[PDB]
Design a protein around this ligand. Sequence first.
Ligand SMILES: O=C(CC[C@H]1CCOC1)N1CCCC1
Ligand SMILES: O=C(CC[C@H]1CCOC1)N1CCCC1
Lengths: 193, 193
Amino acid sequence: GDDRELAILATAENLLEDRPLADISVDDLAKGAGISRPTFYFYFPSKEAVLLTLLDRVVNQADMALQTLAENPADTDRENMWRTGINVFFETFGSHKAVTRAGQAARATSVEVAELWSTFMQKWIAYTAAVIDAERDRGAAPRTLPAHELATALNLMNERTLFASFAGEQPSVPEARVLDTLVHIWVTSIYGE
Amino acid sequence: GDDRELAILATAENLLEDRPLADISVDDLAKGAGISRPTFYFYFPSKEAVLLTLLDRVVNQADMALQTLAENPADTDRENMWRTGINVFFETFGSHKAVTRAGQAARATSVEVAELWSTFMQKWIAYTAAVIDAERDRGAAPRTLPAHELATALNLMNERTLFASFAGEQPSVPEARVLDTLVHIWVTSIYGE
Ligand SMILES: O=C(CC[C@H]1CCOC1)N1CCCC1
Ligand SMILES: O=C(CC[C@H]1CCOC1)N1CCCC1
């Protein structure tokens, strides 16, 4: 039951490494999971629903990892604190490049994918703005831009730059350089007067 | 001749304000430009080709405006210099939101659109990195990240943040706040040690 479901998810993640959602059939997903086509339809209404679940799992893994960090502050300076936080996204989505890529393409077509992404983006920007505000209240960061607008641009930067690096787009920051590049911009723009 | 072509371009830009490329037909473009369907095909091979031309004109208008600026340095401090430069993109693409939006959607499907965007992105990042390097050589900016990697992330930020503001995405920086937000991040990340 849960195993047929996991099998179908594992198949879809594997096939998405080699071709886009468009070039993958329900029959393809069913064959790789070792079930028939009508059995597939019992677990998922469509291949698009399979992607939505895969994306949902990846987004929540990142979200849970960031909640863990939040509850367990690393004992280090502020630059390393922000690095650990962006690193949750670098590692989680970078461990699932095929779902990340397909998920991002699906935002244009699936209101469900668009809404899932928008909900968690709002959550991560609000957390980012809360930390900036705490830093300002403690006197560690200067009161420059509206924290929530600063947070929005910096999370949008990370979305676009990480995902270009992972896809090897032209142009992109090499993946072995993207964490340091983003940490620099976050730290200078948050602490710089 | 050039007028039928301009008519078709003007129609397509007008229709793109109200619905996406998918929901617009060749017959729709032909009717609005006051020509028949086979006459349309004489000027453009497809509605996708019409979008490519519209995007091409918008990208080159921005590129030419930025070349003008480059050749005619504004007499003001460095923060206002970067503001004038990002402002070329804020005004040019913000004056053509429907083409911007459709152009960005078309990157997923049209290799021509993808290649046009990637070529000019490379050009603007190289110009951005050249200015940062000049600033470092004159001693006005510190030698922190690789200028070209810094330039790449900051231009990717502007692409994603401007285009979210213009589309009124959730989340986004309000359009009346996006120029100040981006100038802050560029200035702190370029000059900050
Ligand atoms: O890198 C980040 C988030 C950055 C972390 C760093 C501390 O707060 C959020 N994102 C990319 C995908 C969406 C958000
Ligand atoms: O804002 C910018 C470019 C910023 C200017 C500012 C000085 O050099 C480039 N872009 C958004 C669309 C692509 C690039």
